[PDB]
Nucleic acid binder design. Structure first.
Lengths: 195, 50, 191, 56, 139, 175
RNA sequence: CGUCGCUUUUUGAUCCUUCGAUGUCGGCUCUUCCUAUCAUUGUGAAGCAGAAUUCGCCAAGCGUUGGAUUGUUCACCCACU
RNA sequence: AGAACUGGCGCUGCGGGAUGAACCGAACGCCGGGUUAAGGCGCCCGAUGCCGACGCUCAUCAGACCCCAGAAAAGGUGUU
């Protein structure tokens, strides 16, 4: 139906190309928590070429023209758009299967999130080299919603502990229950063929 | 004045090496300017005494 | 080159006990405790053996700028060992021309209020890094003493004073005025 | 060391195309009967035929 | 941290490559990413496999530095690796991973009927432990 | 030469033809490293013409066989001599590797000259290759594997992406 | 004494474009851009005592005028800054 | 600006060089299957979604493919 990608620990370009192909193949993909997407090169380097991006400004009226987005959701959304044929109506419809969310909204906070090990910083960068966070190059460039998001993450993650705390309550119980066996006639055929 | 303290101020203000290209204020046993703008060059002169 | 490992060790005396959570190191000693995280530096640490307490930092894989940081690790532990038993004391002295420097402490040995520097009206209030102590000397003219456990909180705070007494728009080779550091010592002596 | 006879025939195929071709080298290709690309031909090996194959 | 190394004599599992799924004995590390290996009692002969091919196990073998096939053959079956390798929890998992791959359609039916049976049994039993857990907390 | 793939050592002998002036010329011998035997007897007439007054028209080869190392299982330390060309001038070079075969150690040269010195394989001339025994190595990168009871772990392992589900719910441990 | 470069604000060289036509000097007016920075911010260096200056660095945010002669661009002068 | 030699463009499409008169492949009746040249294979964009091999390099102006669309002398205890 729809896949949900957690975005932290991933690279900017390695994730957004895989989103750009999976969204051309008919799926509905939703990338959540695109605040902590890493991007290679140190922070002062990547903050330069975003400031160079901001002055690409049409001279005669900047109102029409290049729309510099600053939230790291639409930074990630604009990266996918440059890897799509958005001037065609097949490339328009590809963007409508992408819905990107910064932070974690309540339709998407209780789903299970997937990661892409192609795009992870742990996978793909050599560990002795420097990387930039997309959250604080957005915060350095006009994104005025870092504090109101990082408040709502710890309100979100505190509610997620008390779920997981009581989940491992539940599976301590059904593991203590399956000690009370009474069923080893059925345990023959699963251990025989990979329980 | 206090000539024991007069030497201690000159340790931070006069006893240094100046580069002819980056113009930096380096340290008295430099061989190269640390600043990248000259390409870490190796022509240094002592800071001129009064 | 990618050499097989290098390793320095750091011996630990008895009153200090180093425990490590990971690449984070917790150093408890007599005169307090302090901790440093090295989660950027890609090396393993190993304290080995009861009753002798040896810390073994070694890097198995690596290049020449990755080999240079294995000594920087062990030389930061020995500033945590020395500073948690002896402490650090950076005595610094005021050098002045015609105008005497008036230096006082406002807030509990943390804020430093410098006035009459070079005859100027502008006070210069220096708030320090948390963990040092301000103290004007006794049995010495115009000497200021900073004391604490951690060297980088002592030394950076001793740099804020010397940087604040900076003569501007003048010849800096005459006009030798400033509160310069003069001695790098310990709080407890000779241990 | 028994050195064999250097061989008596060759099988010559053409691998380059038709256009942009010097007039000496499109005469010998006409003589070896190699006109289209990827055409092969058995050739007698001789002094007269080896020195054609250096032209081409 | 770094609880198992390569070493002269280290028994390694070979994950991919032309010998995928067989143990080897590391004989000599040759240059930085390639190691001279053999398995005398597990049908893989002497060559240099790359390190990213192999998986380190936790069996060491005390044979000399770069001996012949014979002394490695002695040390493999003095230590009796093959029974110890079957009696480990990691080769049980690669045994279990291939039993699930060769599962026929009739067995997969029989697994299904015996899987959905015992999960009724626990669910009708784990509800009983919930039922007594509130019954402690109600007084 | 392309140095295509792993190389293969050839022993190539050959002699200039018997003129009416000269009967039985001495049948020189070289040691050609080449990817196949057709390149191998082509480099013989490159190297002989720089050393003697011989060429392919007035000469022939009288052997071209693959000569292969006796000990493919024993680890050997190779020291080779180079004559590459640079962008400005040309330089002589000694250079040490450590492989199980002779053609694999000279293959490890051509890759390494292109890596470090950007030297394309037509501009580099192998002079001689032989095994040396230990404690006559000078290179500390080859010397550091001479250690009985050597040991080292494998830190930070990374491989097999897209091999498994590209999309997983599982942050892959690098051990 | 050499010698290596950049720029197209000078002039040339060229003749590719426009001869069923692209309105041709300067001034006025108004906008924006470049930095190879005159001033202004923060600095480094002097044969920097202070004052005034000079040489360099990040740097184009902001300023860089009023007149006599002259069609002038340019020039030259008066005066402020 | 003017010659020589061969090819080309002008008269000529097609694949590749983002774009293009001449470059590199290659020449054309209308089609189906097969295969390749030059070129390529993160995603636009067909094909590396190979458990590719070995090294080199960190740039506060990185670099990145004939013709071809930007640079030198000199210098660097930056690494090899």
């Amino acid at each position: 139906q729809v896949l949900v990608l957690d975005g932290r620990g991933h690279l900017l370009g390695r994730l957004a190309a895989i989103v750009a192909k999976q969204v051309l193949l008919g799926r509905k993909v939703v990338v959540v928590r695109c605040e902590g997407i890493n991007i290679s090169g140190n922070f002062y380097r990547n903050k330069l070429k975003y400031l160079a991006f901001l002055r690409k400004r049409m001279n005669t009226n900047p109102s029409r023209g290049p729309y510099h987005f600053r939230a790291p959701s639409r930074i990630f959304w604009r990266t996918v758009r440059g890897m799509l044929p958005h001037k065609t109506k097949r490339g328009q419809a590809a963007l409508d299967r992408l819905k990107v969310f910064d932070g974690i909204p309540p339709p998407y906070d209780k789903k299970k999130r997937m990661v892409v090990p192609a795009a992870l910083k742990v996978v793909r960068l050599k560990p002795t080299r420097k990387f930039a966070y997309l959250g604080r190059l957005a915060h350095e460039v006009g994104w005025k919603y870092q504090a109101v998001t990082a408040t709502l993450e710890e309100k979100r993650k505190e509610k997620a502990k008390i779920h997981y705390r009581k989940k491992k309550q539940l599976m301590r119980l059904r593991k203590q229950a399956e000690k009370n066996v009474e069923k080893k006639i059925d345990k023959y055929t699963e251990v025989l063929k990979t329980h | 004045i206090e000539p024991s303290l007069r030497q201690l101020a000159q340790k931070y203000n006069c006893d240094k090496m100046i580069c002819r290209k980056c113009y930096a204020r380096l340290h008295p046993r430099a061989v190269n300017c640390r600043k990248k703008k000259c390409g870490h060059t190796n022509n240094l002169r002592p800071k001129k005494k009064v | 080159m990618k050499t097989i490992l290098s390793n320095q060790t750091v011996d630990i005396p008895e009153n200090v006990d180093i425990t490590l959570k990971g690449r984070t190191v917790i150093v408890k000693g007599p005169r307090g405790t302090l901790r440093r995280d090295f989660n950027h530096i890609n090396v393993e640490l190993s304290l080995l053996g009861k009753k002798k307490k040896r810390l073994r930092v070694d890097k198995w894989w690596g290049n020449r700028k990755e080999l240079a940081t294995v000594r920087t690790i062990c030389s930061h532990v020995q500033n945590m060992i020395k500073g948690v038993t002896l402490g650090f004391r950076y005595k610094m002295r005021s050098v002045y021309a015609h105008f005497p420097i008036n230096v006082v402490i406002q807030e509990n040995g943390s804020l430093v209020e410098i006035r009459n520097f070079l005859g100027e009206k502008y006070i210069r209030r220096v708030r320090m890094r948390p963990g040092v102590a301000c103290s004007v000397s006794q049995a010495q003219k115009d000497e200021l003493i900073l004391e604490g456990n951690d060297i980088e909180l002592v030394s950076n705070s001793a740099a804020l004073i010397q940087q604040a007494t900076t003569v501007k728009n003048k010849d800096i080779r005459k006009f030798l005025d400033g509160i310069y550091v003069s001695e790098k010592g310990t709080v407890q002596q000779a241990d | 060391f028994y050195v064999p006879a250097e061989p008596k025939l060759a099988f010559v195929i053409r691998i380059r195309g038709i256009n942009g071709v010097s007039p000496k080298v499109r005469k010998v290709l006409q003589l070896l009967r190699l006109r289209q690309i990827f055409n092969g031909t058995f050739v007698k090996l001789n002094k007269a035929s080896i020195n054609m194959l250096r032209i081409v | 941290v770094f609880r198992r190394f390569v070493e002269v004599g280290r028994v390694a599992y070979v994950s991919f490559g032309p010998h995928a799924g067989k143990l080897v004995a590391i004989v000599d590390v040759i240059d930085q990413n390639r190691a001279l290996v053999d398995g005398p009692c597990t049908q893989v002969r002497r060559q240099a496999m790359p390190f990213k091919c192999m998986q380190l196990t936790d069996f060491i073998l005390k044979f000399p530095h770069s001996a012949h096939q014979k002394y490695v053959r002695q040390a493999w079956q003095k230590a009796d690796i093959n029974t110890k390798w079957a009696a480990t929890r990691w080769a049980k998992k690669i045994e279990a991973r291939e039993r699930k791959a060769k599962m026929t359609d009739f067995d997969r039916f029989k697994v299904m009927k015996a899987k959905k049976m015992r999960n009724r049994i626990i669910k009708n039993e784990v509800k009983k432990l919930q039922k007594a857990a509130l019954l402690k907390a109600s007084p | 030469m392309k140095a295509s793939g792993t190389l293969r050592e050839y022993k190539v002998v050959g002699r200039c033809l018997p003129t009416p002036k000269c009967h039985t010329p001495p049948l020189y011998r070289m040691r050609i490293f080449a990817p196949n035997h057709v390149v191998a007897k082509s480099r013989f007439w490159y190297f002989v013409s720089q050393l003697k007054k011989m060429k392919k028209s007035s000469g022939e080869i009288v052997y071209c066989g693959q000569v292969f190392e006796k000990s493919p299982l024993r680890v050997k330390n190779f020291g080779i001599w180079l004559r590459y060309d640079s962008r400005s001038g040309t330089h002589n070079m000694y250079r040490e590797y450590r492989d199980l075969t002779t053609a694999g150690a000279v293959t490890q040269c051509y890759r390494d000259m292109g890596a470090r010195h950007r030297a394309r394989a037509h501009s580099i001339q192998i002079m001689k290759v032989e095994e040396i025994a230990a404690s006559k190595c000078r290179r500390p990168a080859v010397k550091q594997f001479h250690d009985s009871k050597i040991k080292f772990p494998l830190p930070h392992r990374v491989l097999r992406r897209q091999h498994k589900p590209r999309f997983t719910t599982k942050r892959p441990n690098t051990f």
